[PDB]
Amino acid sequence: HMYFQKARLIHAELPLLAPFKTSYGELKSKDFYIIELINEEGIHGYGELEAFPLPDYTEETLSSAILIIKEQLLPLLAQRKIRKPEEIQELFSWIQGNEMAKAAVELAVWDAFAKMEKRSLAKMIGATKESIKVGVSIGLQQNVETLLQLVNQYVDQGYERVKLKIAPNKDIQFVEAVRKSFPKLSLMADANSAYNREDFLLLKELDQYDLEMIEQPFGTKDFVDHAWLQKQLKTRICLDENIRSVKDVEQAHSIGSCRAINLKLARVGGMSSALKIAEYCALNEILVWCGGMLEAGVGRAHNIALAARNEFVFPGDISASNRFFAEDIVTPAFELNQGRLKVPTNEGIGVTLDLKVLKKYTKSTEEILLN
Amino acid sequence: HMYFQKARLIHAELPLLAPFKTSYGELKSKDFYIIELINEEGIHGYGELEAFPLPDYTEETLSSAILIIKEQLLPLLAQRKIRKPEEIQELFSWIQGNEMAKAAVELAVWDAFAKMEKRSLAKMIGATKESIKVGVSIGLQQNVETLLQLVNQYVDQGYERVKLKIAPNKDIQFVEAVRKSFPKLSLMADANSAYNREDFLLLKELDQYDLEMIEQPFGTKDFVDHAWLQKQLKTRICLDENIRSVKDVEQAHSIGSCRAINLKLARVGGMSSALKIAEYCALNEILVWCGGMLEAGVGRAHNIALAARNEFVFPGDISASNRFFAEDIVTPAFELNQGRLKVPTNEGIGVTLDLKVLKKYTKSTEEILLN
Ligand SMILES: [Mg+2]
Ligand SMILES: [Mg+2]
């Protein structure tokens, strides 16, 4: 039982060690928001808005999402008494789409409760693991030779799973190379909606490489063509973009669009929603794993608590800050210990903000009286 | 061949005669934007942003959409030379969702071209009609008696089609009443996503009332449950919310989710997109008609040109301004002549702005240089 006294929206931007390539862009940093929800008893809950700057991933964007947060989500909490962190998905239920905005606010509310109950956010959602095996993603390489070198570094580093980025001209030849060299390494392929039905031959040729899964070969809204392809392959197909809720998984399932789901907290609307989906995939043999969105310290802390659940077996897209950022905004840095990350045990998300580090990356601060 | 010199974003709000009820709200007016695109040869193209204030219809909202227009759509036109109005859907293609933002800008570009070619926008997209039969929508009534009275007024007024709003407790008993009283009046039912699979009995009981169609009984993102229902009915099922493109219709089709499509320019991203869909429904026996979004003068003018196409047979949701607004922002008011509206013949959308009437409803004006 708690009431949210005020909200503090912090806009920050972290320098990426290396540029991140998106569909129709290239990130040079992680532009995000920190939603700080403050209890009426002095507890601070933290969430992170993950929306990319361009609507080249999903329809949402940072500027538009934070706008929906201010004009749509925060006003709802203003009055309200919240009893379960899960009541949040409900009052936001009438809102269509805008999942990443909801997530930023809702995940803050969860952290606030786990804090109140002196538990890890991981402990609270029921997780038991104390560490989780994270994976690694490699983009497109011009050389097969150089891909194999990159693949070698990580394996030696402890990463027990590798996601290879695929594309019509650079697909089958690279998968072999890696498969016929790491015959026991779990390996998946991400096709970033680069194929058409006409390329089913190319896609069928990958079935025989024991690929863990092939992510979104066709349209970002497609169910039909995916199903038409899934029925012709042994490898699981994985959806991403069009998976926003359990309801969305249910459709993909009955249609037979996929056998695996790339679950990302932000894209799915929060924690309540993510768990419902995890539980459902578990009951229907659908492989579920935590994808990523270049999260800063706060985003990553939540992601790891979700990843700690038993349903998640496949290594997710989480990693030590040091892989992307020169610096992060969370005090207990995430140490990579041979393909594994330590699940926070401290109250809430388990990590604190370097109000120091933050200050030098903060572009604006806004406080909102939810009362 | 034209280049857009500048853009003028006019924010206006018209007083509604009577309150308009939305899913989780009630409009008291039409808050919208007018996108005025100005040629390099002095031609003015006009579009209208239709997004509702709350994300209770689709994910978009006026405030967030106009934000996407400024930050995402207008910058693309800045440099560009446009040869066909249809080039607009293309450069916006990489953008996910955000259809109502696209529409406001793209429809402006069409009007600008039809103007350049001294043709009606209706003439240009190929329409031939000179008038179109519009319908009328009635919300939920407490009395069956009073619904029948309302139904009587319109029929005598000339409306050749009536859309009845349906809901679990107020459905079958009203349909009869109207059907067993106007045995020859085309009649459809709009279920505004108020039913579950468990209510298929209720929905099957309507099949026998020669209902033209039943709009979105189930989820606003659902294809599956709709298909499961369509296969059990004679009446056509009509989708709305989840129909954003030809591609979306293609899925609904192969899945068998519907037999009719409620086509609204804004929700579908513009004219290029709307025509593609109309043509497709025509080739695949799918009933297509123009739905509405409480358009002001500009929105309505475009809608009527689309409605003039041959594919649209069923009366759309268009009407004389006088049905909703005390005043409108378009000089040649739309006269209702026994269920029909006269298709503009004047250049472009065929109507002019009462810069006078506008001024007293304008809340802000913003000019943006595209050179
Ligand atoms: Mg993806
Ligand atoms: Mg509807």
Least Cα separation, residue B14 to chain A (angstroms): 21
Q: How many separate helices (H) and strands (E) can be counted in chain A?
A: 13, 15
Any binding-site annotation on B240? Answer: yes
Q: How many separate helices (H) and strands (E) can be counted in chain B?
A: 13, 13
The C-alpha atoms of residue B157 and residue B171 are separated, in whole angstroms, by: 25
| Identity of the residue in A68, A96, A222 whose CB atom sits nearest the CB atom of B58 | A96
- With 0-12 / 13-18 / 19 or more C-beta atoms within 10 angstroms meaning exposed / middle / buried, residue A221 is middle
β-strands A161-165, A136-138 pairing: parallel
Encoded amino acid at B324, one letter: F
Q: Which of B23, B26, B49, B61 would you mutate first to test chain A, the one with the most A CBs within 10 A?
A: B61
What was the structure determination method? X-ray
The C-alpha atoms of residue A169 and residue A366 are separated, in whole angstroms, by: 47
> How is residue B357 written in tokens?
């009437």
From the candidates A264, A356, A359, A363, give the one annotated as an active-site residue. Answer: A264
Are B68 and A64 inside 8 Å of each other by CB?
Answer: yes
A window 53-92, beta carbon within 8 A of B:
54-59, 61, 63-64, 67-68, 71-72
B355 and chain A in contact, CB less than 8 A: no
The C-alpha atoms of residue A179 and residue A157 are separated, in whole angstroms, by: 18
Strand partners of residue A30: A14
From the candidates B28, B133, B165, B180, give the one annotated as an active-site residue. Answer: B165
Q: Torsions phi, psi of B339, nearest 5?
A: 65, 15
> What's the angle, vertex CA B368, arms to CA B114 and CA B45, rounded to 5?
10
Nearest CA in chain A to B63: A67
β-strands B25-38, B6-22 pairing: antiparallel
Instruction: Yes or no: say if A195 and A225 are a contact pair by the CB < 8 Å rule.
Output: no
Q: Is A17 helix (H, G, I), strand (E, B) or coil?
A: strand
The C-alpha atoms of residue B229 and residue B216 are separated, in whole angstroms, by: 11
> If you measure from the C-alpha of residue A239 to the centroid of ligand 1, how many angstroms do you get, rounded to a whole number?
8
Strand ranges (E), chain B = 6-22, 25-38, 44-49, 131-133, 136-138, 161-165, 186-190, 213-215, 236-239, 260-263, 287-290, 340-342, 362-369
Among candidate residues A303, A253, A249, A251, the one with its CA nearest the CA of residue A277: A249
Please name the residues in contact with A79: beta carbons below 8 A apart, sequence gap of 6 or more: none
Any binding-site annotation on A248? Answer: no
> DSSP letters along B204-251, please?
HTTGGGT-SEEE--S-SS-SHHHHHHHTT-SSEEEE-TT--SHHHHHH
Tokens 């793209």, located at residue: B106
Strand ranges (E), A23-158 = 25-38, 44-49, 81-82, 131-133, 136-138
The C-alpha atoms of residue B81 and residue A330 are separated, in whole angstroms, by: 48
Are A222 and B248 inside 8 Å of each other by CB?
Answer: no
Least Cα separation, residue B56 to chain A (angstroms): 6
The C-alpha atoms of residue A216 and residue A264 are separated, in whole angstroms, by: 14
Select from 3.30.390.10, 3.40.640.10, 3.40.50.2300, 3.50.50.60 the CATH code of B1-118+363-371: 3.30.390.10
> How is residue A294 written in tokens?
């270049």
- For residue A214, the surrounding DSSP H or E stretch is strand A213-215
Instruction: Yes or no: say if A32 and A50 are a contact pair by the CB < 8 Å rule.
Output: yes
From the candidates A30, A102, A133, A165, give the one annotated as an active-site residue. Answer: A165
Any binding-site annotation on B156? Answer: no
Are A247 and B219 inside 8 Å of each other by CB?
Answer: yes
The DSSP call for residue A330 is B
> If you measure from the C-alpha of residue A265 to the centroid of ligand 1, how many angstroms do you get, rounded to a whole number?
14
Rounded to 10°, the helix A99-116/A297-307 angle is 80
Select from 1.10.3720.10, 1.10.357.10, 3.20.20.120, 3.40.50.970 the CATH code of A119-362: 3.20.20.120
Maximum Cα interatomic distance, chain B, rounded to a whole number of Å: 62
Among candidate residues A256, A197, A261, A192, the one with its CA nearest the CA of residue A225: A197
Clarify whether B165 is annotated catalytic. Answer: yes
> How many other C-beta atoms can be found within 10 angstroms of the C-beta atom of residue A24?
13
- With 0-12 / 13-18 / 19 or more C-beta atoms within 10 angstroms meaning exposed / middle / buried, residue B169 is exposed
Kindly report, as residue ranges, where domains of CATH 3.30.390.10 are found in chain A. 1-118+363-371
The C-alpha atoms of residue B141 and residue B157 are separated, in whole angstroms, by: 20
Kindly report, as residue ranges, where domains of CATH 3.20.20.120 are found in chain A. 119-362
